[PDB]
């Protein structure tokens, strides 16, 4: 029934609940079934990054195209490994093997963020070359 | 140096990193020291909710002011208990007691969300009375 369009009480209660839920999801480890969507999000954000990079390559010196092309390939690879460990981890849910598969998951994810940051670094250095820094 | 104002590569890499970090914070349990800010957020959102409710009471039948006033008092109370268990949990960080104190934390937090939802319910029922539902 009720219209919540400018129902601040309803808004502020949704906010308090959301905050209790971020707090609890962060204190707690997630049920393997609840991390497919999370890995899905990671996948999207990477797919978007790679598209953007694809459209930046042409404006940067050819002298650099390959180093960047390699940094891209490695990111796709890391998502490879991360999807792997994720499936293994769903497989062993509730067993004595579940823990070691979360850890190989975090390691794969962490490697992806480190290699994404390295991608920024190669691309900024190519940007600094076209712009002509001393 | 570089201006990131419309640097989409930098934007998309921050996004991929943020997503890896939400995924990892959610798979993993948080270091007791990292949940003060989280409980702080919960506190703010509740303080805002209670302010909004304070400003809605006068427009709803006096016949209901007290039930709502009690639901407010209980929310403040639950934040009471939640801050307690949080401090206890920081206290016992790395000990054999740390776990049981996270659980009493999640229980307190969860009780707060349930009692916040009940606050919406009392207030919607008071709204349905002023508006004149059949």
């Amino acid at each position: 029934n009720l219209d919540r369009s400018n129902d601040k009480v309803y808004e502020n209660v949704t906010g308090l609940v959301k905050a209790v839920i971020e707090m609890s999801s962060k204190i707690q480890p997630a049920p393997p079934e609840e991390y497919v969507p999370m890995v899905k999000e990671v996948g999207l954000a990477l797919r978007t990054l790679l598209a953007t990079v694809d459209e930046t390559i042409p404006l940067l010196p050819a002298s650099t195209h390959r180093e960047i092309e390699m940094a891209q390939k490695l990111l796709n690879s890391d998502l490879g490994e991360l999807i792997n460990k994720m499936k293994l981890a769903q497989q062993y849910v509730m067993t004595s093997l579940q823990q070691e598969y979360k850890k190989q998951m975090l390691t794969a994810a962490h490697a992806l963020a480190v290699d994404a940051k390295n991608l920024l670094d190669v691309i900024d250095q190519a940007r600094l070359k076209m712009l002509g820094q001393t | 140096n570089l201006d990131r104002s419309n640097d989409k590569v930098y934007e998309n890499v921050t996004g991929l990193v943020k997503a890896v970090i939400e995924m990892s914070s959610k798979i993993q349990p948080a270091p007791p020291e990292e949940y003060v800010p989280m409980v702080k957020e919960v506190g703010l959102a509740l303080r805002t909710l209670l302010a909004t409710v304070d400003e809605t009471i006068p427009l709803l039948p006096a016949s209901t002011h007290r039930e709502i006033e009690m639901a407010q008092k209980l929310l403040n109370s639950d934040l009471g208990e939640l801050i307690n268990k949080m401090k206890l949990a920081q206290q016992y960080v790395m000990t054999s007691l740390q776990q049981e104190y996270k659980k009493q934390m999640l229980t307190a937090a969860h009780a707060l969300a349930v009692d916040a939802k009940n606050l919406l319910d009392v207030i919607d029922q008071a709204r349905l009375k002023m508006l004149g539902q059949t």
């Binding site: 949704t14 839920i21 | 919406l120």
Partner: peptide, 12 residues
């Protein structure tokens, strides 16, 4: 309250 209940149901 259907979206708020997606949330209330998230705490089980």
């Amino acid at each position: 309250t259907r979206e708020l209940d997606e949330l209330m149901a998230s705490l089980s």
